[PDB]
Amino acid sequence: GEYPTVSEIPVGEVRLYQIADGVWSHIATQSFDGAVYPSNGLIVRDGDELLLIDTAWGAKNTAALLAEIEKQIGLPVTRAVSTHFHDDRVGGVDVLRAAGVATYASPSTRRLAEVEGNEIPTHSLEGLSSSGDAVRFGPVELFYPGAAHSTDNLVVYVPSASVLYGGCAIHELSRTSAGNVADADLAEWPTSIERIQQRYPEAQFVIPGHGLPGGLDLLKHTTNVVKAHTNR
């Protein structure tokens, strides 16, 4: 009840929100490009362990995230997947690594993180090189839909809970602009969203990279906003 918003989270703190049985989002905030933004990740129960999707945008936040997970859930985080190479997704990987978490990303994400100067997940995910590729990874499916917010961006589906985590490829309804498009492929982004729509029509909950969860309408919303941005 009441998903937390940016005014409810001081930078440095992390909230968890149970989305469904064995699926939570984590929500943190950060100062960026002259504003304060919220950021979501995902936590998925993996037997008696946890699979983490994305850091909490930095070392300080990610430390808070690990503490909050122990406090509220009390199962160990054994694996983490970063869904693209920007700092809101890999920033805090070293904190995860030091805590004994195995960190993963596609080869493309690892390479781009290195070029950018960001933290580099240790493990490489295989089978996600080409638009339309999917692989099972523990209790989720990882899907590379094609370039969108970034050329490497992955989305994550939790089949047991019908939860689709879009990361920064999916915008919340409140957002009217396409966000930070410095590394985006605006031309491909609607096509990549269509691949997601066609693959996961059964999604009940859709979690954007930043802001409020909704339903599958978030996909249409994203292509609306992305097209409007492209057009000026």
Give the residues lining the site for Zn ion (CB under 5 A).
Answer: 86, 88, 168, 209, 221
- Specify the residue, 121 or 209, whose C-beta has the smaller distance to Zn ion: 209
* Catalytic site includes residue 149: yes
Q: Which of 40, 54, 86, 153 is catalytic?
A: 86
Q: Which residue in 183, 209, 232 sits closest to 82, CA to CA?
A: 209
Q: How far is the CB of 185 from Zn ion (least distance, A)?
A: 12
Q: Which two tokens stand for residue 125?
A: 């995910």
* Catalytic site includes residue 180: yes
What distance in Å separates the CA atoms of residue 153 and residue 101, rounded to the nearest whole number? 21
231 by Cβ neighbours in 10 Å (0-12 / 13-18 / 19+) ranks as exposed
- Specify the residue, 46 or 88, whose C-beta has the smaller distance to Zn ion: 88
Q: Which two tokens stand for residue 175?
A: 């957002």
Q: How far is the CB of 115 from Zn ion (least distance, A)?
A: 14
Q: How far is the CB of 120 from Zn ion (least distance, A)?
A: 16
Q: Which of 26, 84, 210, 221 is catalytic?
A: 84
- Specify the residue, 46 or 223, whose C-beta has the smaller distance to Zn ion: 223
Strands (E) in 125-169, as ranges, are 134-137, 140-143, 155-158, 163-167
H-helix or E-strand spanning residue 112: helix 107-116
* Catalytic site includes residue 88: yes
Q: Which of 54, 87, 88, 152 is catalytic?
A: 88
Q: What are the catalytic residues?
A: 84, 86, 88, 149, 180
